Amino acid sequence: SARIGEVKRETKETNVSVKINLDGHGVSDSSTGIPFLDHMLDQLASHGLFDVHVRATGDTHIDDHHTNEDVALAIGTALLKALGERKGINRFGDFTAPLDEALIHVSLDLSGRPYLGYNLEIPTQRVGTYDTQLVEHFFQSLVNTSGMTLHIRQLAGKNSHHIIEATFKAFARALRQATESDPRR
Amino acid sequence: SARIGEVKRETKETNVSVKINLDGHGVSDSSTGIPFLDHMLDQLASHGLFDVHVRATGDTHIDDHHTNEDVALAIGTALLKALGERKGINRFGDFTAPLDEALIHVSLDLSGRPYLGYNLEIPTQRVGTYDTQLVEHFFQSLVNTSGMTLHIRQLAGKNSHHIIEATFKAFARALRQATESDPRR
Amino acid sequence: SARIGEVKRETKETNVSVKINLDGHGVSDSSTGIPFLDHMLDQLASHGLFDVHVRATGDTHIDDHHTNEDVALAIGTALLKALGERKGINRFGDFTAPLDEALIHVSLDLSGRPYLGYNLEIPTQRVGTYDTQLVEHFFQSLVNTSGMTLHIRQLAGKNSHHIIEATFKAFARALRQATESDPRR
Amino acid sequence: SARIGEVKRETKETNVSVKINLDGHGVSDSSTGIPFLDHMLDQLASHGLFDVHVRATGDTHIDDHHTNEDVALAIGTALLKALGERKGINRFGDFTAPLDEALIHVSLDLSGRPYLGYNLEIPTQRVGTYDTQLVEHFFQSLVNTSGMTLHIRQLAGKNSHHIIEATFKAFARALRQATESDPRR
Amino acid sequence: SARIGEVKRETKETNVSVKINLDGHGVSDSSTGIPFLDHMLDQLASHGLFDVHVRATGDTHIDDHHTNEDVALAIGTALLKALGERKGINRFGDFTAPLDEALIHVSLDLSGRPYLGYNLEIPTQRVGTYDTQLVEHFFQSLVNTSGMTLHIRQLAGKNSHHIIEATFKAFARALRQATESDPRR
Amino acid sequence: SARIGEVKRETKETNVSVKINLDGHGVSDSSTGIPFLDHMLDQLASHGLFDVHVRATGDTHIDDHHTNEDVALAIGTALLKALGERKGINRFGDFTAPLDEALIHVSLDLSGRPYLGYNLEIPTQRVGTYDTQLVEHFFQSLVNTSGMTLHIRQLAGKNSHHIIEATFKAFARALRQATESDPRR
Numbered sequence A, B, C, D, E, F: 001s002a003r004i005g006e007v008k009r010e011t012k013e014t015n016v017s018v019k020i021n022l023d024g025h026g027v028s029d030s031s032t033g034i035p036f037l038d039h040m041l042d043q044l045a046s047h048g049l050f051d052v053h054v055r056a057t058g059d060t061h062i063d064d065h066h067t068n069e070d071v072a073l074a075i076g077t078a079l080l081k082a083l084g085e086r087k088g089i090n091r092f093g094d095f096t097a098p099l100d101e102a103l104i105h106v107s108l109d110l111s112g113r114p115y116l117g118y119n120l121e122i123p124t125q126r127v128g129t130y131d132t133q134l135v136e137h138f139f140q141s142l143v144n145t146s147g148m149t150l151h152i153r154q155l156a157g158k159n160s161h162h163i164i165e166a167t168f169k170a171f172a173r174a175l176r177q178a179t180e181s182d183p184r185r
């Protein structure tokens, strides 16, 4: 029986719907109003083998910040819901992924205690129209509602898109590991 | 009897109308042609319990600068008008507000002598489409027409939107304090 | 009608019961198995005018860590419960308190987003039998379950007991401010 | 047929009995006379899925050193015995585990050649009553009798209990990996 | 049906034949005219569970460079051929292996885009008769024809043979992981 | 008989068609969806006397990265195809071109071994709407599919458009030299 979490959340600023299947096939269905974030959520699905359905609208004329934040918060809650009683899972994930010259290590523990350790140094301010400060905020907000211990470490990288995408690949693979069944539990 | 100041000001560059109620309920009604500034003026209303009505148009195809400046000048004048004879008010305000990792101290004196002390270090050039140099200019122009002594001190912060928004929260709360009745005066 | 939050939480390591009245009279009733923590919780009650009832037992033969953490987590949850819908409160608190040569600034926002900014430099490892690393962990854990934005800044201090106690005084006064009714809301 | 190693060792200073099942269920049964070490050995069992039975007595009135050392030596020998001919196992283990802000990488090879690489910087001298110098000595002594190549690397951390516990989690998971069957061997 | 790639390549300088089975049993059959390289290719087979058959002759009286390069190029092509359509594989590999005091991290992606990140600092010029500059060139040439993203990071090490051998162990294990079936794909 | 290479390549992200005549007249016919890249490809044609026909579409709403990369990859392949057996050509090219204050040296070898040496320091993040990180990626991707040894050295320059355009002029002239007939071969 697949582990599925669903969240709908509305504020004056944003409207967000998330559905995540931890036992998915990598089905990617994300439309946030932030194209670069959509691309990253596609990576989350494809590299994590999650099914990810996201819809968001919001006040992107002000900036992408509120949308990005509210999407992340809802994803964190959806993950928490999907995990249920967390019985029999690996709990810990650890993966280091490259994307060309970029190399990003992610380690996480589905601990119930939120913590983000993050040291990315993204050398440009905009990837497409996406404000690169928002990457940290995405992970911070996700951690806060999921109750995840998450460390993200930049080991190499120069191209901003590579750095951010490698982060999502590594995160997805680490989260896949953590959420999967431990065969001895 | 509520303290209300109104200003209409037209130049070749901009057209601005401001109405501020110092004894308001936080009614936010701001449309400047600069969405991020609108968002900040909403914070001013909600955190200061001012009623803030602003309309502006201007030469935003050149850049947001003239609009931002002329809005600020008019707000400063409206504040001055609303304050009237300044009898029986606290006069001084002092508040430090966070927004997540950002922490901003504002101290002000409704002194009749303009002065801005400002040390924000906003680490990105654009929040949405808003040029972050314009934050200092907003406060400088406001001080100049209001005749306010204003100090803004960045105690912490990394996210530009957080830094700027925390500034407006702290300013609003400090200005609320300064404009309110001193119960012993 | 007084705002009261109650939490009972048991783990393999600890057993904790907390009851907090936000609208209290400073009634202090704290027994955690960690005498220095009891003393600090007494300060929280007396300086914040909270009624604080805490009972904890745990694995203090290993060290005080699990007890300290679980007490803090439960207090954060109790605060959250007590706050209820958070209508009409100040929400923000800001206070700087001395204790002799020590001087500690606390700023907080009852925001729903956990964040701790903390820069205390406590110059000794043990105050009585209390491990001074546990002060940061107390506030971090409290923030995490309460969903509080909390900044703690050491402005001066040399004596470890003074530094820590001044922190609790400042925190208590800032939290009192934040939880109290805003008379214009 | 489960791989079980047993050691009894007596000196003038200490008396130690160890039984370890490499193919266990995480049964934790450790009483060394050093409560913090007991807690760490519980982590070894739970995170490694070893069954760990330890009893020790010794000259803890002098300090915990001889007990800690003799426990570690006996565990290393028990591991060696349990491994038997080492046929068909992964041999290598590599895992990085967090505990909140702490992040510890362990890499090991069941090589038959003892080596410890260790760079932990534990910022306090006592965790509970446990001398934090003894952590290095525990791993060194274990390596020496097991004939293990072991590298322990502190990637992040501030709280001493977190640093040490994360080390044991990472070690346990790496040792589980190394001792498990390689499905292609 | 085992994935086997075969390459024969002749130049004026060298003559090389390679056959690699990705689904092997660790059969090592390598004779390049460079004994140290043979030893490393044996590690590749044994730690990766590849079957590796290599024969090379060349102008080693000039130096080992052309042989080393042409062997590496052919291995990269053989890997590419063996991988075929790359369907259903893990694609990514990440492993850190010790050899006594040496500790080497390898991360790779079978991406189709060649990239080598390499930071080994091998402290001697010759291991046996093998020029230690040739290690980097081996991996660079392999990457270039395989279309692999490869990062090699020296975490510790002093003995040149240990450093280089640990690199091949880590690489072999990471490449095994990447080339193996993903059980959910 | 003119040396013409043609490539059509489609991915989920981009659709690219390239036709290059090494023995051209400088016919420029490039439409990539990235106006600045079009301008640079026009320089390639005019300064190299290549006929360059490029059409690309792609996911430029995410950013220009995938388009830029896929165009470059296809150009590299087209060059490789056009070169055919590479008989009788100069093979090496070396040219240094100014554009006002900018001065860029390009040296290349049509070697069959991909390598990019690149040290441009482009002082602004956007030239028009073009992300200046993409210049390095363009040349890297081109090198990777063409099998070119390419060195790009910034000798002087301040204006980003000048720096990048001078690079394309120098590259075009060096590539013209390398691809032309050696009159003694």
Ligand SMILES: [Cl-]
Pocket (backbone or CB within 6 Å): none
């Ligand atoms: Cl590392």
Ligand SMILES: [Cl-]
Pocket (backbone or CB within 6 Å): none
């Ligand atoms: Cl201060």
Ligand SMILES: [Cl-]
Pocket (backbone or CB within 6 Å): none
């Ligand atoms: Cl030169």
Ligand SMILES: [Mn+2]
Pocket (backbone or CB within 6 Å): A065, A069, A137, B100, B162
């Ligand atoms: Mn935010």
Ligand SMILES: [Mn+2]
Pocket (backbone or CB within 6 Å): A039, A161, A165, F066
């Ligand atoms: Mn991408």
Ligand SMILES: [Mn+2]
Pocket (backbone or CB within 6 Å): B065, B069, B137
């Ligand atoms: Mn101006």
Ligand SMILES: [Mn+2]
Pocket (backbone or CB within 6 Å): A066, B039, B161, B165
């Ligand atoms: Mn905002």
Ligand SMILES: [Mn+2]
Pocket (backbone or CB within 6 Å): C065, C069, C137, D100, D162
């Ligand atoms: Mn803890």
Ligand SMILES: [Mn+2]
Pocket (backbone or CB within 6 Å): C039, C161, C165
């Ligand atoms: Mn005291």
Ligand SMILES: [Mn+2]
Pocket (backbone or CB within 6 Å): D065, D069, D137
């Ligand atoms: Mn000793």
Ligand SMILES: [Mn+2]
Pocket (backbone or CB within 6 Å): C066, D039, D161, D165
């Ligand atoms: Mn513990």
Ligand SMILES: [Mn+2]
Pocket (backbone or CB within 6 Å): E065, E069, E137
């Ligand atoms: Mn060479």
Ligand SMILES: [Mn+2]
Pocket (backbone or CB within 6 Å): E039, E161, E165
């Ligand atoms: Mn060897």
Ligand SMILES: [Mn+2]
Pocket (backbone or CB within 6 Å): A100, A162, F065, F069, F137
């Ligand atoms: Mn790319």
Ligand SMILES: [Mn+2]
Pocket (backbone or CB within 6 Å): F039, F161, F165
């Ligand atoms: Mn031009």
